[PDB]
Amino acid sequence: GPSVFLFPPKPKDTLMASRTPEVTCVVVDVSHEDPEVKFNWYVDGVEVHNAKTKPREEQYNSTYRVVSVLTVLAQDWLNGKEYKCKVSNKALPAPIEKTISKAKGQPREPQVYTLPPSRDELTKNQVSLTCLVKGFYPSDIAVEWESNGQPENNYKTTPPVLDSDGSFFLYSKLTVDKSRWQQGNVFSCSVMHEALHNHYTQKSLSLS
Amino acid sequence: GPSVFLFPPKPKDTLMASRTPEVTCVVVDVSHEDPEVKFNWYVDGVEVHNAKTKPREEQYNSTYRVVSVLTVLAQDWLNGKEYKCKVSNKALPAPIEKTISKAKGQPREPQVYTLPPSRDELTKNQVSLTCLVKGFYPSDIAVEWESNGQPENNYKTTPPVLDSDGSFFLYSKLTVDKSRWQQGNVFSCSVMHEALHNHYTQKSLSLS
Numbered sequence: 001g002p003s004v005f006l007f008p009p010k011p012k013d014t015l016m017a018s019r020t021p022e023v024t025c026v027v028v029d030v031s032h033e034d035p036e037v038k039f040n041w042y043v044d045g046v047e048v049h050n051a052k053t054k055p056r057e058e059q060y061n062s063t064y065r066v067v068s069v070l071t072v073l074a075q076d077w078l079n080g081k082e083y084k085c086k087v088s089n090k091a092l093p094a095p096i097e098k099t100i101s102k103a104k105g106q107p108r109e110p111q112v113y114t115l116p117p118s119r120d121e122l123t124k125n126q127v128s129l130t131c132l133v134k135g136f137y138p139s140d141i142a143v144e145w146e147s148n149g150q151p152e153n154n155y156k157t158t159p160p161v162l163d164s165d166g167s168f169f170l171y172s173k174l175t176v177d178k179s180r181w182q183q184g185n186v187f188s189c190s191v192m193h194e195a196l197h198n199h200y201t202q203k204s205l206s207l208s
Numbered sequence: 209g210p211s212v213f214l215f216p217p218k219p220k221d222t223l224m225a226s227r228t229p230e231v232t233c234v235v236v237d238v239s240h241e242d243p244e245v246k247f248n249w250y251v252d253g254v255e256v257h258n259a260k261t262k263p264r265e266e267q268y269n270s271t272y273r274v275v276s277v278l279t280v281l282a283q284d285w286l287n288g289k290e291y292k293c294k295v296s297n298k299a300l301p302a303p304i305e306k307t308i309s310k311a312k313g314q315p316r317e318p319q320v321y322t323l324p325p326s327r328d329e330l331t332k333n334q335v336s337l338t339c340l341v342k343g344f345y346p347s348d349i350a351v352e353w354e355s356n357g358q359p360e361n362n363y364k365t366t367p368p369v370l371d372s373d374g375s376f377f378l379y380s381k382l383t384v385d386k387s388r389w390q391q392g393n394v395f396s397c398s399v400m401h402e403a404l405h406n407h408y409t410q411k412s413l414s415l416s
């Protein structure tokens with residue numbers, strides 16, 4: 001019958017003080033004469049009832065896409081609790097159990113390095129500011145760019161990539177009008193990861 | 209029933225002269241009561257019988273895995289031709305016609321900028337050499353690193369990322385012993401893409 005998917009909390013949610021991290025159990029392609037879907041939430045094999053499965057949603061598929069959401073404690077996500085989602089139905093000869101948890105493995109402090117635009121790139125109106133983040137484990141992480149306290153718009157970050165030593169790296173590309181980098185403006189690559197002091201580091205990036 | 213997955217050729221196989229590009233039809237979850245699988249490859253509608261359904265392979269989870277492979281003209285792919293794989297199983301209520309082609313749109317030339325390690329990283333044993341390749345379209349691309357005619361081993365490349373303007377970028381990180389970067393060796397990032405002159409370009413990178 002149906003098919004189930006289970007989502008981790010966002011990295012920023014598990015690593016920053018007053019946020020609301022939450023793993024999300026999502027059901028697709030249910031029945032119709034059997035819309036009664038039960039969820040059962042277990043933390044490390046212990047059932048918690050502190051959930052809230054927001055109402056069924058009639059889709060144009062003629063399926064009810066139901067969604068449950070467990071607000072989890074950020075220290076729980078980090079200390080590596082397994083969140084198991086049991087989903088019951090009539091279309092199920094047996095329920096569905098999907099389990100999720102932070103990657104297990106020894107965490108690794110990311111190295112953060114800011115790279116200025118290529119000398120070749122100066123013949124362009126816009127320049128590329130680069131942020132290199134390597135040797136982190138596990139892959140969960142967040143990178144933002146700002147200048148003078150205020151955030152920056154025009155950046156994109158590659159996904160984490162498994163490096164040769166079993167750690168991850170990524171790059172973040174920030175784009176600015178050459179004029180801005182020229183004036184001597186300062187920009188900042190911010191990074192959030194668990195193996196960081198206060199879960200937070202940052203690196204400025206300026207011309208000479 | 210069974211599912212199907214169609215795959216494009218490898219970028220370098222459609223970009224470099226004497227290579228042999230192939231699209232590949234992979235059928236999975238095949239049974240045993242009606243396990244005869246027939247393929248009827250069509251190219252841009254007008255059928256092709258230059259195909260090959262290389263022999264039947266088993267699988268772990270008691271399921272099955274049947275893979276055909278059409279060798280294809282490289283320039284044909286670049287022109288934009290549609291490649292149709294047509295499967296015929298009996299556990300099917302109907303044959304499948306999954307389609308694949310190159311990304312439509314105006315091919316754009318990649319920009320290639322090499323980037324020396326951050327001064328901060330010179331206090332490490334190994335250093336990171338960085339190749340920023342941006343503004344290309346479509347995403348199909350190949351990147352390689354080398355020095356003195358020999359290739360380099362220790363490198364990794366992020367997947368193409370969609371940029372704010374509809375173009376792709378990526379980075380490639382080459383990792384070497386610091387000592388080799390102090391000698392002032394020359395290192396090169398090579399990029400193969402359909403929009404370049406001879407589908408090829410390369411960028412030096414060396415110590416100041």
Ligand SMILES: *[C@H]1O[C@H](CO[C@@H]2O[C@@H](C)[C@@H](O)[C@@H](O)[C@@H]2O)[C@@H](O[C@@H]2O[C@H](CO)[C@@H](O[C@@H]3O[C@H](CO[C@H]4O[C@H](CO)[C@@H](O)[C@H](O)[C@@H]4O[C@@H]4O[C@H](CO)[C@@H](O)[C@H](O)[C@H]4NC(C)=O)[C@@H](O)[C@H](O[C@H]4O[C@H](CO)[C@@H](O)[C@H](O)[C@@H]4O[C@@H]4O[C@H](CO)[C@@H](O)[C@H](O)[C@H]4NC(C)=O)[C@@H]3O)[C@H](O)[C@H]2NC(C)=O)[C@H](O)[C@H]1NC(C)=O
Pocket residue numbers: 211213215232234236237267268269271273
């Ligand atoms: C029993 O086992 C087998 C074996 O699989 C595994 O084996 C064991 C050992 C364990 O690892 C198990 O986890 C697992 O069972 C099962 O066979 C599997 O079948 C599933 C689906 O039923 C497949 O998932 C899909 O994978 C394809 C991509 O496949 C390539 O890449 C894989 C990794 O990404 C790689 O493992 C494969 O071998 C394969 O390799 C590529 O093949 C070409 C040609 O050979 C090669 O040249 C490439 O280099 C190579 N690439 C590599 C190596 O990475 C993926 O496309 C599927 O995702 C699409 O479809 C989904 C719908 O199911 C959808 O959810 C996704 O979002 C995505 O949708 C597509 O999105 C694109 C945009 O990107 C869009 O254009 C399309 O329209 C859209 N397609 C749709 C929706 O139609 C999906 O991830 C497994 O690959 C396959 N395993 C292998 C290894 O063959 C078997 O089914 C199992 N039985 C059971 C229990 O069901």
Ligand SMILES: *[C@@H]1O[C@H](CO[C@@H]2O[C@@H](C)[C@@H](O)[C@@H](O)[C@@H]2O)[C@@H](O)[C@H](O)[C@H]1NC(C)=O
Pocket residue numbers: 028029059060061063065
């Ligand atoms: C059926 O549709 C379900 C809900 O998707 C939503 O409604 C469809 C019609 C679109 O409007 C879509 O953009 C919405 O998100 C899906 O969750 C479900 O997977 C679909 N079933 C399948 C597998 O086709």
